[PDB]
Every structure is written in structure tokens, then in C-alpha cells.
């Protein structure tokens, strides 16, 4: 009956003066817009149908046309920015917020979903959705004693939409919206559905991707231990955002970073730094690099947890981008560590893979490595053992690599190397 209508038949039905004809035609639009290959979103927009769909959202007396129109609009709003905008410019935002209170769960859920698509377009629409008062009624849908009594699909949608309200930057969401959402998010993060957990992690990851005061608002809610537990989950779609959030946190103050350590994060790193997914290995190593940029007692915990050999491992063999994070981690460690910590690093075998990386054609990694080498020499000066290190560097091919880099195009590179040769190899 409503399979494969043409756009002009949809239009004819929608402009009939007959609410049931209008319902049918709307559902026909919903089915066109639901198909996998190339839903004709532009054709429906150009036929002028958005304003009619939007007025159908307000038909309380006809729940099925509210549902079909909400579903149609959700799929228009899922497309490009220009398509999401046509939905917003039709007045959809306030009309979807009013349907959040619908007694029909499947309608309320559709409105949740549509608002998530709108907010997911970017900061401006996210902030407009917020200004129109969406957060109170979204959160009231989750004001239940036990999230387990909600339908699973519905909870997941609510979680995803909330995550889109937490998204983006330039600007980040209003501080007061973040304060209002956070307690519900903390509760979703203790829920047992893997997709709610994933999306709650994603939300927390967005909220920690910012300056220290943004990180603080999250860390103060006590979530860091739960994030560490999710870090150890078997599902990759959970570990990925949990690790992004932990990483973001450790870009903050040394005290914020200490909370991550205190909660036991370092114990999961032997597995993250060997994870078969190269993106996890990369972000794990990035995260290490920010922990090795902290204080000496923090560097010591990296040492006590047995993580220096895992950094030697990733330096020795990993995807190139992960190796570049490892080089950063080593330059940070050597720049802030004690003499003893730096010696330990050499005893773990850091020099040979560091030298092997000097033949990379990435001039950033080269500077990072030269800085590390200079720092390690500086610790050896203090013990009077620059020679022993010089020999170690020469024996694995490292002197040849540094000699060459005197003739490198970049300025800091030729300088840094000239220095080392002049200072330690003449």
C-alpha cells in the first residue's frame, strides 16, 4: 500500500485535505526515506514537505502521523548539514522537544533520536537544542529508580543523544548544561549494557577534551575508577572511548593525572600497549607520554608497573604513529626523570630502537629523538659515563645516523646533531 510511492504521489496525499490520506502519504515518505540506497532526501526537501511534517508532529489527536512524521524528519536530519538545517528551519526543534513528553514511548524515542541528529550536526545546533529546553525533559525520561526497567533500544537512544549534547568544541557546551547532564551520565556509566557504556564513555571523552577546568568537572564526580574498570573491558567499542577519556584526563594537571594512577590504570597498560588494534596501541602510548610528562613520583610508578620494557617494545616495533608517541614518551621521561630513572631506561634497552628510528623521514620524530639522546647524555655526564653511552650508540649504528643528520635540511636537526657529535663523539 505505502511501498515505493513517487514523490509527487506523496505530495498529493499530504496536500489532500484528509488526515488519513495525509497519514498514508507520510508513511510512504517514511519508507522512501528509510531505504538503504540513496534515500531521496533532497527531493522530499525540494517538494516543500518539511513544514507539513513539522505541523504533523503537533497532531496529538493522531499519534501514528506524529510517529511517521517524526521518523521521516529524523532521516532528513541524519544527512548533511544543509539537510539538518532544513529540518531546523522548519521549526522542528521545539516540536520534537514537546514530543519528549508523549505518552507513546515509540514517539518519545523518535523525538529523542531526531534531537540527537540535530545536536550532532555541530556546536551551533547543539547549543540551539539546549536553548530550546531539551535537557530537562531528556533527563526526566531517565529519572527512574533502576535504568534496567527501561527498554533497551530506548535507553541506548537516550544515551547517544545525551552524548551528542556533550559533543564538540569551539565552543564546548555551556558549563551549566554540562553540570546538569553529568550526574545522569555518571549513572549511565554504571549500567550493564555494552552500547550504553560505550556511549557514556564517548560523552565523558568529549567533556574531558578541553582545558583543565573542563577535566576537573568530570574528575570531581568520581568517575575515574569506573573509567579504569571499563578500560579493562573485553569489548573494543567500550575500551576505545574509555581510553580516549583517560588519555584526555592525563593531559590536565599532575593532580588530575594522579587520580588516573591511583585508580589502577597503569596495570592495564601491558595489555593496551600490546593490543592488536593499532589505534588502541597508539592512544595507549600517547596516554603514557602524558604520564611520563608528569612528576618524578609519577615516572616512578610507570617504572614500578613494569612499563618501561613495554615502551621499549613499542619503540622497537609498532605502527609508525605509535612509534612516534613512544618517542615522545621517552623524551618526556628523559626530560623530567631522575638520573636513576634515566639509567634504568638505558638498562631496559632503549638506545638501539631509538637509534633505529633516526632513519625515519619525519623530521618531527627526529627532533624528539635527538632531544631524548641529549637528555640521556646529560644524565650520563652527571655519573661521568658519557663514554660508555657513546660506545653503546656507536656499536648499534647510531653514530652513523647522527653523522648523517648534520647534513639534514631542517635547522634544529643539523644543529642538535652537530652538537652531539662535537660534544660526545670528537
Amino acid at each position: 500500500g505505502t511501498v515505493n510511492w513517487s514523490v509527487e504521489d506523496i505530495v498529493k496525499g499530504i496536500n489532500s485535505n484528509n488526515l488519513e490520506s495525509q497519514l498514508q502519504a507520510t508513511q510512504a515518505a517514511r519508507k522512501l526515506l528509510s531505504r538503504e540506497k540513496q534515500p531521496p532526501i533532497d527531493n522530499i526537501i525540494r517538494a516543500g514537505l518539511i513544514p507539513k511534517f513539522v505541523s504533523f508532529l503537533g497532531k496529538t489527536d493522531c499519534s501514528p502521523i506524529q510517529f511517521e512524521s517524526a521518523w521521516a524528519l529524523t532521516n532528513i536530519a541524519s544527512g548533511t548539514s544543509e539537510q539538518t538545517k532544513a529540518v531546523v528551519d522548519g521549526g522542528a526543534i521545539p516540536a520534537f522537544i514537546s514530543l519528549l513528553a508523549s505518552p507513546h514511548a515509540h514517539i518519545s524515542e523518535q523525538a529523542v533520536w531526531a534531537l540527537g541528529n540535530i545536536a550532532g550536526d555541530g556546536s551551533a545546533f547543539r547549543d540551539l537544542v539546549i536553548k530550546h529546553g531539551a535537557i530537562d525533559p531528556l533527563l526526566a525520561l531517565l529519572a527512574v529508580p533502576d535504568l534496567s526497567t527501561l527498554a533497551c533500544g530506548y535507553l541506548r537512544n537516550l544515551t547517544w543523544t545525551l552524548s551528542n549534547l556533550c559533543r564538540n568544541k569551539n565552543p564546548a557546551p555551556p558549563l551549566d548544561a554540562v553540570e546538569q547532564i553529568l550526574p545522569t551520565l555518571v549513572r549511565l556509566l554504571h549500567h550493564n549494557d555494552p552500547e550504553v557504556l560505550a556511549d557514556s564513555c564517548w560523552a565523558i571523552s568529549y567533556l574531558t577534551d578541553g582545558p583543565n577546568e573542563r577535566i576537573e568537572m568530570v574528575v570531581k564526580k568520581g568517575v575515574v575508577p569506573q573509567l579504569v574498570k571499563l578500560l579493562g573491558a573485553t569489548e573494543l567499542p567500550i575500551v576505545t572511548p574509555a581510553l580516549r577519556a583517560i588519555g584526555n584526563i592525563v593531559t590536565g594537571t599532575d593532580e588530575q593525572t594522579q587520580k588516573v594512577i591511583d585508580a589502577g590504570a597503569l596495570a592495564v597498560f601491558p595489555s593496551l600497549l600490546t593490543n592488536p588494534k593499532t589505534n588502541i596501541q597508539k592512544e595507549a602510548t600517547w596516554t603514557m607520554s602524558n604520564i611520563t610528562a608528569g612528576r618524578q613520583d609519577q615516572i616512578q610508578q610507570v617504572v614500578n608497573h613494569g612499563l618501561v620494557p613495554f615502551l621499549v617494545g613499542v619503540l622497537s616495533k609498532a605502527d609508525f604513529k605509535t612509534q612516534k608517541e613512544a618517542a615522545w614518551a621517552i623524551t618526556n621521561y628523559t626530560s623530567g626523570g631522575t638520573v636513576e630513572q634515566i639509567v634504568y631506561l638505558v638498562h631496559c634497552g632503549i638506545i638501539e630502537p631509538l637509534m633505529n628510528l633516526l632513519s625515519a623521514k619525519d623530521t618531527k620524530i627526529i627532533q624528539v629523538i635527538l632531544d631524548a639522546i641529549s637528555n640521556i647524555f646529560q644524565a650520563a655526564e652527571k655519573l661521568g659515563e658519557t663514554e660508555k653511552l657513546s660506545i653503546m650508540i656507536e656499536e648499534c649504528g647510531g653514530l652513523d645516523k647522527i653523522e648523517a643528520l648534520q647534513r639534514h635540511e631542517n635547522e634544529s636537526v643539523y644543529k642538535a646533531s652537530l652538537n652531539l657529535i662535537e660534544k660526545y663523539f670528537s
Binding site: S34, R35, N117, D121, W202
Partner: peptide, 13 residues
């Protein structure tokens, strides 16, 4: 210190 979830989703069924 140095600084994947779909933005939008269409409903098919």
C-alpha cells in the same frame, strides 16, 4: 603535555 562515534544516524527499520 600534548592534546569515531557516528554524529548522526538514520533509522532504517
Amino acid at each position: 603535555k600534548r592534546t569515531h562515534r557516528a554524529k548522526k544516524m538514520s533509522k532504517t527499520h
